[PDB]
Structure 1
Amino acid sequence: GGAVKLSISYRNGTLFIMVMHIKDLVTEDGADPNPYVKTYLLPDNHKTSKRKTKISRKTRNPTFNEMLVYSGYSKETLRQRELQLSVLSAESLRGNFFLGGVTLPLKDFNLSKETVKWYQLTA
């Protein structure tokens, strides 16, 4: 269900997640969604680590260019965490439905470098 391009970096105690754009989203009903991107820093059992982009209206290829920021973690701590990224449609007459997501263990990243990559959305 499409792919998201992210820039991931770390400086001054802060994980920076730049959500750039998404391509080729699909809806079951065939109407254009109103995507926004939401992330949680797992583990999280009470949802206290949410971040959200703004809504992008009526498009299967949103551009956000939006920084989501997690301050106050050491690199050693982040290596125990997973970035859970979800794409959702903001809807006024029905539930905000899921369009795909991806979960990125932070142990996979060189946090001394900026990592710009596409990621496949799955269900």
Structure 2
Amino acid sequence: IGGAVKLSISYRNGTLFIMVMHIKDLVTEDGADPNPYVKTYLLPDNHKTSKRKTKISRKTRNPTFNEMLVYSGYSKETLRQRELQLSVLSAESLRENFFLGGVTLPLKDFNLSKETVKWYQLTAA
């Protein structure tokens, strides 16, 4: 577990925008290059509908995604009662997908009237 993810987070027209830009310095226990993708949830997830994820970036510890994850139909009031749970996992075809690191971000901490671009350190459980 290690590394850091750069995100751009904003809100416009009743929609939350999470831009996954890139990740640096992912590590694996056995030293082989992972196949990272990013998955996010908005928690708590009453209806169990909030999974979003990026494409897989293959064979790299420093993936660039520049992908936008979109959450529609939420008011800021509701969002301030949610946390964004971000996971980085390796896509594996011959073994279980495994956890490379994550970060949980209470959305109340953001100024959702502007765009916030920032680096976040990835951690364990």
Normalised by the shorter chain, which TM-score bucket?
Answer: over 0.9
Runs of 4+ in 1 over 2 A off after TM superposition: 44-47
Cα deviation code 1:25-62 (max 9, x no counterpart)? 00001000000000000002664210000000000000
Q: Quote the Cα distance in structure 2 between the aligned partners of 1:7 and 1:105.
A: 15
TM-score between both structures, scaled by the size of structure 2: 0.96
Name whichever of 45-54 and 13-22 sits farther off: 45-54
Give 5+ residue unaligned stretches, structure 1: none
Q: Quote the Cα distance in structure 1 between the aligned partners of 2:49 and 2:115.
A: 26
* Contact kept? 1:6, 1:117, Cα under 8 Å: yes
Q: How high is the sequence identity, in percent, across the aligned residues?
A: 99
Instruction: Tell me the residue number matched to 1:10.
Output: 11
Give the paired residue count: 123
Give 5+ residue unaligned stretches, structure 2: none
Distance 1:23 1:46, change over 3 A: same
Cα deviation code 1:52-104 (max 9, x no counterpart)? 00000000000000000000111111000000000000000000000000000
* Contact kept? 1:19, 1:66, Cα under 8 Å: yes
Distance 1:71 1:58, change over 3 A: same
Distance 1:78 1:46, change over 3 A: closer
Quote how far apart the aligned CAs of 1:120 are. Answer: 0.4
Distance 1:29 1:47, change over 3 A: farther
